[PDB]
Amino acid sequence: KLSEEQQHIIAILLDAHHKTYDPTYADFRDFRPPVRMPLSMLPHLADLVSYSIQKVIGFAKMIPGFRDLTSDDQIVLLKSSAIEVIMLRSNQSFTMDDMSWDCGSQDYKYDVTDVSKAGHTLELIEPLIKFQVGLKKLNLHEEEHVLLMAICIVSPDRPGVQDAKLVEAIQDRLSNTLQTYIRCRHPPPGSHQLYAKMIQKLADLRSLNEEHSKQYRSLSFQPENSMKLTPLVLEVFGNE
């Protein structure tokens, strides 16, 4: 069964996610408006990414053990994982009905063309959509989804990590919780090789991160596009 510590860990991460992910998307009204006519969707989508980084941070601070890391390592982990957790957490709004992210209204429904109108190409978008479909298809429990985000953040192999032993230790506690959760609470047939498939998604996220990094470097290098970004996005993803 799940130990009391494992049950504790899950409860904390569920609550953390609930406190940082508003399924009504009410705060979207505060963003620069979407424009679908250049890079017309960049102001709206940069604000959405900026907002999302803040939420990912609020979630990360609540991960059991994350507080025991130094601020240096906290920074390295958040900076390397931010885009990956945003792509992960975005699965909640993603829908296979029409391959889009549906955040409540037609204004806040983003399709492949919207993403391309933020300065990114199919080199990123096609694998991103394929990621989202394969992730959807796993039909994760919310418990598994929040554990996966947390494991994504506390990855010891991120470049610049100083205390990799401690990061690996925190991650192992989460990974063991997820494996045990799948065994005890996820019924077959759904549970078939589920953990291995979740870890494969973390691998897919690394390739998405690399490609995002490449396209962002190129996008932000043009000072007219970097003007469209936010101070937080620049700090987290880079300022040329």
Partner: peptide, 11 residues
């Protein structure tokens, strides 16, 4: 590298 915003949000 200096990450005052990230640092601030991390508390």
């Amino acid at each position: 590298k200096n990450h005052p915003m990230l640092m601030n949000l991390l508390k």
